[PDB]
């Protein structure tokens, strides 16, 4: 398979769960300054085989994601799936939020966005009634199209972590790598050139944040990125293993550039054709390599009966200092005027 996979033994999973539960006892919140600082060191106490996997798999050249299977989740303890991300920090989900951050700490520095889900670091992916046909994570009936997370931003995550709290109907996350076996060298050349526009996605809009947050200055920066996007490349780095920056619904060619458009058009077709499925069953965690792969989510019919699919999510950078220009008073919540 095109991702790297690790299955916790029941004992290893229990030990990891126990560690997260201890953290949940000792800290007030996952996004508090204290746990943000301590989590990377506390993570050193996770099962050694898992730490070895995370240290090695991160350095392999090929995988689109690192997938860890077998974290126990008790639906009775977890409670009902929240109706909105706003109210999704439920006591039942609290230990698993801590668990996700512990795993994340092995791969890098976690962070959030001032303009997304009220500046939370641990965020939620769940269907919101009335928002089935939107372009955001809370959609359902409309497929979430493939994308690089926060493609518009130079400070976008290196890895995106997704922990499945529940997924009773096995709804697939989608993935695709760079279609290197089919991109001709001229098209490739053009994709490496700064000839494309990527605008911020709808999750960064004021309407998709709580009314209280609407005043934030960081929404100014989002508006600038939407109104006056600077041309950037889709592919960067090594021609034989390029890094990818694209969003199927928020990318465009530079104005009037038909050669760039043709390259983007070809890329779309090749990515659509090579898109594959990864089902995150309850307790599965994936860390998607946001430079090697784009990802999305298959269309599904939401339940709204309290047992909808529900993920916890977190952004990870290999280097927090790369985004210091966007440190919005805090280094862990990013945005700009």
User: What stretch of H or E contains 55?
Assistant: helix 48-57
* Residue bearing tokens 């996770």: 46
Evaluated on CA atoms 80, 83, 87, 93, the torsion sign reads: positive
Site size for Fe ion (CB under 5 A): 1
Nearer to a second copy, 139 or 290 (CB): 290
User: What stretch of H or E contains 186?
Assistant: helix 185-191
Structure tokens at 163: 């922990």
| Residue 44, contacted partner among a second copy, Fe ion, ligand OKG, none, CB below 5-8 A by kind | a second copy
On whether 238 is known to bind a ligand per the annotation, the reply is: no
Among 22, 51, 89, 307, binds a second copy (CB under 8 A): 51
Of 20, 294, 301, 25, nearest in space to 163 by CA: 20
Nearer to ligand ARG, 57 or 285 (CB): 285
Question: Under a CB-based contact definition with an 8 Å cutoff, are residues 4 and 65 in contact?
Answer: yes
Nearer to a second copy, 94 or 332 (CB): 332
Positions in 57-96 near a second copy (CB under 8 A) = 59, 61
Alpha-carbon distances, residue 108 vs 17, 39, 292 (angstroms): 20, 11, 17
CA distance 102 to 314: 11
Alpha-carbon distances, residue 125 vs 128, 135, 140, 179, 275 (angstroms): 9, 13, 10, 28, 21
* Strand, helix or coil for residue 323: helix
Residue 120, interface with ligand OKG (CB under 6 A)?
no
CB of 301 to ligand OKG, least distance (A): 14
Positions in 291-310 near a second copy (CB under 8 A) = 291
CB of 62 to ligand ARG, least distance (A): 24
Structure tokens at 161: 């972590």
On whether 80 is known to bind a ligand per the annotation, the reply is: no
Nearer to ligand OKG, 149 or 257 (CB): 149
Structure tokens at 94: 């609290």
On whether 247 is known to bind a ligand per the annotation, the reply is: yes
Count the Cβ atoms, other than its own, within 10 Å of residue 237. 12
Residue 295, interface with ligand OKG (CB under 6 A)?
yes
Question: Which spans of this chain sit near ligand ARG (rule: CB under 6 A)?
Answer: 135-137, 144-145, 147, 149, 201, 203, 247-250
Positions in 155-184 near ligand OKG (CB under 6 A) = 162, 173
Kindly state the DSSP code that residue 11 receives in the 8-state scheme.
H
CB of 224 to ligand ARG, least distance (A): 19
Binding site for Fe ion (CB under 5 A): 149
Binding-site sequence positions for Fe cation: 147, 149, 295
Binding site for a second copy (CB under 8 A): 37-38, 40-41, 44, 48, 51-52, 55-56, 59, 61, 109, 158, 237-239, 241, 291, 318-322, 324-325, 331
Binding-site sequence positions for L-arginine: 135-137, 247-249, 313
């Amino acid at each position: 398979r095109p991702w790297s996979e690790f299955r916790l033994t029941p004992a290893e999973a229990a030990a990891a769960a126990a560690l997260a539960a201890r953290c949940a006892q000792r800290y007030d919140e996952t996004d508090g300054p204290e746990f943000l600082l301590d989590a990377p060191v506390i993570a050193h106490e996770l099962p050694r085989r898992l730490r070895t996997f995370m240290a090695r798999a991160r350095l392999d050249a090929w995988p689109h994601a690192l997938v860890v299977r077998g974290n126990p989740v008790d639906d009775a303890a977890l409670g009902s799936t929240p109706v909105h991300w706003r109210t999704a920090r439920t006591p039942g989900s609290r230990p698993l939020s801590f668990l996700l951050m512990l795993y994340a700490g092995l791969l890098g520095d976690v962070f959030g966005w001032a303009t997304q889900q009220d500046g939370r670091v641990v965020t939620d992916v769940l269907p919101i009634k009335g928002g089935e046909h939107t372009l955001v994570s809370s959609s359902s009936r409309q497929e979430l199209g493939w994308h690089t997370e926060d493609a518009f931003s130079p400070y976008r995550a290196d890895y995106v972590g997704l922990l499945s709290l529940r997924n009773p109907d096995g709804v697939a996350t989608t993935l695709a790598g760079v279609p290197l076996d089919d991109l001709d060298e001229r098209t490739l050349d053009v994709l490496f050139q700064e000839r494309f526009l990527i605008r911020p996605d709808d999750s960064h809009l004021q309407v998709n944040n709580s009314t209280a947050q609407q005043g934030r200055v960081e929404f100014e920066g989002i508006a600038q990125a939407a109104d006056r996007p600077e041309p950037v490349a889709i592919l960067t780095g090594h021609r034989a293993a390029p890094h990818l920056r694209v969003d199927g619904d928020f990318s465009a060619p530079a104005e009037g550039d038909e050669e760039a458009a043709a390259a983007l058009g070809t890329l779309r077709k090749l990515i659509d054709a090579s898109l594959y499925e990864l089902v995150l069953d309850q307790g599965d965690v994936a860390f998607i390599d946001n430079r090697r792969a784009v990802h999305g989510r298959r269309a599904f019919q939401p339940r709204y009966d309290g047992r909808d699919r529900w993920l916890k999510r977190i952004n990870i950078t290999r280097d927090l200092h790369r985004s210091r220009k966007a440190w919005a008073g805090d280094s862990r919540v990013l945005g700009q005027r």
